[model samples]
Target: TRLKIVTIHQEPFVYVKPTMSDGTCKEEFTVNGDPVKKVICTGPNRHTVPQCCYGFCIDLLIKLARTMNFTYEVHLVADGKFGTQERVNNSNKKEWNGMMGELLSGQADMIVAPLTINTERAQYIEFSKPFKYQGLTILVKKGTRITGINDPRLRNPSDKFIYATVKQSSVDIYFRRQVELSTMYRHMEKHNYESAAEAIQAVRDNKLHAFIWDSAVLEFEASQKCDLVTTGELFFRSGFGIGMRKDSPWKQNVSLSILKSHENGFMEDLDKTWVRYQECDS
Candidate 1:
C-alpha cells in the first residue's frame, strides 16, 4: 500500500536540501531503503522559493508516521526555512487551492502541514483527530504583571484588556470569540496585525499591551528577542490534524493513529522535540 504525503517545507517543520556528494546537487533526505516512494511537492522555482523547514510541524508528522507504522513517501518543496522567505514564497492561491489542488485531484493522499483544523477547510477535506494543539496566548511586556488564566483583573468588567493580533489569522478569530475576548468582550479592546511577527513586535514596541499566537510560533519568535513575555496560560487549544480527501476510508485509521499517539505520550515527546524555543517569559 502506498501512503503519499504532501507537506510545505517551512522552518522548524521541514529542513532545506543539503549539498550532495557531487557537490553540485543539493541533497535532502538520506533516503533510507523503504518500500514507499517519496515525491517532493514544491521546491524553489522561478515562481516559488523554498525556506528553512522548522520542526514544529515536522515533529508531529514524524510521530504520526511512527504511531501508524506505515511506509510512506514525502513530497517536499521549497528550502524549508521560515520568516520572509516563506512569506514571500507562500502561495497566494485560494485556500487549499494550490498544493491541495494536487491532493484533491488525486495526486497525493495526505497533507501534514501545520494545518489548523477549522470548519472552513473541513468543507473540502476530512481531518484526523487533532494530533497537536497550537493556539492563542497573550504576550505582555516584562514586569507588567499578568499571570495565568483566571486572573480577576483580566476578567473584571471595570478593567479593559487591550490586545493586538494578526488580522484574519487563527489567533484573531479564536480570541474574538474564543479566549480573552470572549471572556472579556465587554471590557476588552482588540487590535489586528498584518502578520504574527508584526503583532509580536507591537508588544515589544509597547504600542499594544499584548499579542496572541500559537504557543510554538510565539515562543520561537520571542526567543529571537528579549523585550516581550508571554502572559497567561494557553487559552484556546487549536488542534492540527492530517488532511485527507473528504469521506476517505482512511479517516478512521488516521484518527486512531492520532489517539494512539496521544495515549502513548508520543505527542508529548514530539512537542518537546520541536517546541524547544517556546519558553514564555513571566
Candidate 2:
C-alpha cells in the first residue's frame, strides 16, 4: 500500500523549496570534478514522490521507502505543530493537535521528523526505534546577563521575567513540569509561542526574557538571528523517532528498515551529513 507521510518544514530535518518551472527540482552536485545540476525528480507531479526534500529525516524516509518497496506521499502539517495533547475547555478528555491529530484521524500514515519519543505520545501512537538523540536548551539575547538555569534573579517575584517555548513541543512539557515542581526558578511567566521564529522574535522585542527549545534548533536559529545566543546547558535528553499509527501493519517493517540502516552505517552517515557539521555549541 502507498503511504502518506506527514512532517513540518523544519530545517535540517525537512525543508520545502519552490518547484522549478520545468517540472523538476534542481539541486547542486559535483559531476566529474565539475559543478553540475542534480535532478531529484523528472516526471508528472506525483504526490507519491518527494520533489523538494533533502534533510536527515527526508533522506531516511527515502531509504526506508526503497527498502520496503513502497511509494509514499508527503504532506506538510497545516498547523505546523509537532504534536501535543491538550484539554479543551470543560472537556473531560484531551484533544490531539498538529501531526498527532493527522495521524490519529487517518489523515496521514506516518510522521517523519524530529519528533521526540515520549511516554505521553507513545500512549497514542507507536514509535520506531530512535534514530537520533538530542537535548533541550535555552536561548537568550546576547549579553542578557543570565548566569545559569538556577539564576537567583529568576526567583524574584517582582522580576516578571517572561519566557517563551513552542506550544506543544517537548520543551513545553519539560517547562511545565519544572515549573510545577519548582525545580526551576519560580515567579517567571511562560508564554507558548506557535513556532520557534515567533518565540525568538519575542526575545528580540524584549517581550520574552528567553526561549527554550531543542539544542540543534536553537543553534540554527542563533546563526540566523545573530543577536540571540544559547545559554546554560543541555537538559532533558531525548530521542527522535518516527511516529506511526497505533496497530499499524507497517510498523515492524519500518522498524526493521531503521535497524538495517543502523547496522549498515547508513544512519551514521546521515548523522555526519546533516548534523555533525552544525556548530551546536551551548
Candidate 3:
C-alpha cells in the first residue's frame, strides 16, 4: 500500500519548478564543496511548498516516507489552474467522493497534508501530534493605530470599526466570540467575506478597519501583493496535525515522530529557518 499525501503548495515551505529568471526558481546551496541543482518539483499541492517552518514539516513527511519504506506520491494540480472554467466545468464530486472513500476504506495508508485537527474533524479521523503551532491573527493597514488585542479604543461604540473575516474560519469564530460579540460587539460591525483574500483587500483598501484570520493564512496572504501588517502575538494557539483513518496502528508511531522531532531540535530548526528568518525579516 502506498501513502498518498496531499499538500497545498506555498512558498518558504515548498517551492515549485518553472518560474521567472529570478532566484525564485534557483535557490542557492552547497553539496560538499560543490554546487548542485536542487530541482524543485510540483509538490503535494499546486502552490510552491511552504518555506522554513512549514517546509520542515514537508521535509519531515519525506523523511517519514523514507523511513517507513513506503511508496509515496504527492497529488496536486498546477498553480492558478483550478480557477479555469475548464477545471470547474469538468469538476464532479465523483473524484473527490471516491478519493475520500478510499481513505476510509483503507485504500490509502496515511495522510501528511497540513491538515488541521479540530474537535469536529476528530470525530472521523485520528490525528498525530501537532507538527506546527499557529493561531488566528488580524492584518490592518500598515499605519493604522490598532494597538493590542484588548485595546478599548478599537471598541468605541461611536467609532464603528468595520471588521471583515473569512467565511467559516476559526478566526471568524474567534472574532465573533472574542471580539465582535463580546462587550466590544456594540462598537464593531462584522462582515462575512466570501474569501480571505477579499477580506484582506477590504482591510487594505480601508474599506474595513481590519481582517481577522489564521496567522498562517494571514502570513501567506501577506506574502502576496498586499500592504497590510500582521500582529506579532498570535491570538489563537491551534496546531496542524497529520490525519489518519480512525484507530490506525500508525497513530502512536506518527505521534512519536513528531515528539522526536521536537526533542531533537528538528522542529525548532525548521521554525528558525522558515519562521524566524523568512517571515520575521519580511
Give all candidate RMSDs, comma-separated: 8.1, 5.2, 7.4
**Candidate 1 lDDT by residue in tens digits, 1-282:** 867776764334444453335533333332232222122334553554323333545556555667667666656522221111012235654433333454676757887776667765566778888876676676777666776445566666342556655544444444455654576543433456654556666777777676656675665555545666677468767777788898887789889877887888877765555555345443
The sequence of per-residue lDDT tens digits that candidate 3 reaches over residues 28-64 is 4432333323323333223455222125446767667
Please estimate how well model 3 matches the true structure, expressed as its whole-model Cα lDDT.
Answer: 0.56
Summing lDDT over every window of 10 consecutive residues in candidate 2, give the lowest-scoring window. Answer: 37-46
For all candidates, the clash counts are: 26, 0, 13
Q: What is the TM-score of candidate 2?
A: 0.79
The segments of candidate 1 whose C-alpha lies over 4 angstroms from its true place after superposition are: 1-46, 50-54, 63-109, 143-163, 175-194, 205-209, 219-226, 276-282
lDDT string for model 2 (211-281, tens) is 76887777666755668888757756788889998888888998899888888998887766665544534
TM-score ranking, high to low: 2, 3, 1
Model 1: ten consecutive residues of lowest lDDT: 79-88
Q: Which residue pairs show collisions in model 2? A: none
Off by over 4 Å in 2: 21-23, 29-51, 88-90, 153-160, 177-190, 201-207, 223-227, 278-282
Error of 1 at 24 (Å): 9.2
Per-residue lDDT value at 59 in model 3: 71
